[PDB]
Amino acid sequence: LYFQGADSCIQFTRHASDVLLNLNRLRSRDILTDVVIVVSREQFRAHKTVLMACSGLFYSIFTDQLKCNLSVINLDPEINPEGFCILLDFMYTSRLNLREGNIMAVMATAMYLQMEHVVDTCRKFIKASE
C-alpha cells in the first residue's frame, strides 16, 4: 500500500522495510557480501553499506581512503560476539533483542560501534530496571 505523503509524492509504506528485508535475505544467502567482521575469532559476513548506514565506527572506517578496501575488519577482542550478533541483526531488521542477560554486553558493543540511538535505548531500559 501507499499514501499521499507530506509532500505531493506518493509514498510506499512498506518500501524501506521491504528493502531491508531483501538486504537481510541477501546476507542470509551470502550474496554480494563484501566484508567479514571478526569478533573473538568468530566471523560475520555483511554488506559495508548497511554497516555504514547504521554505525558511526563503520562509517569512519569505510570512508577512509586506506581502510575502505579492506575485506576483513577485526574488532576489539574484548567485544562479545553475541552482543555484535544482536546489533548486526538489528541493523538488518529494525528489531533489537534486548534482555536482562545481554543488555550490558549489547550497550557496550553499541557504544564501541557508535550506535547512539541504541545506546540511549539501553540506558532507558537499565534506568527503569533500577
In this structure, are strands 72-74 and 42-46 parallel, antiparallel, or unpaired? unpaired
Judged by CB under 5 A, the chain residues 33 through 62 that form the site for K ion are: 40
Interacting span for ligand 7Z6 (CB under 6 A) from 18-26, 41-49, 60-68, 82-90: 18-26
What minimum distance in Å lies between the beta carbon of 92 and ligand 7Z6? 12
For 3-41, b/e burial (b = at least 16 CB within 10 A) is eeeeeeeeeeeeeeeeebeebbeebeeeeebebebbbee
Quote the CA–CA distance of 110 and 122 in Å, as a whole number: 9
Nearer to ligand 7Z6, 26 or 103 (CB): 26
Interacting span for ligand 7Z6 (CB under 6 A) from 22-30, 39-47, 87-95, 97-105: 22-30
Q: Which among K ion, ligand 7Z6, none contacts residue 33 (Cβ within 5 to 8 A by kind)?
A: none
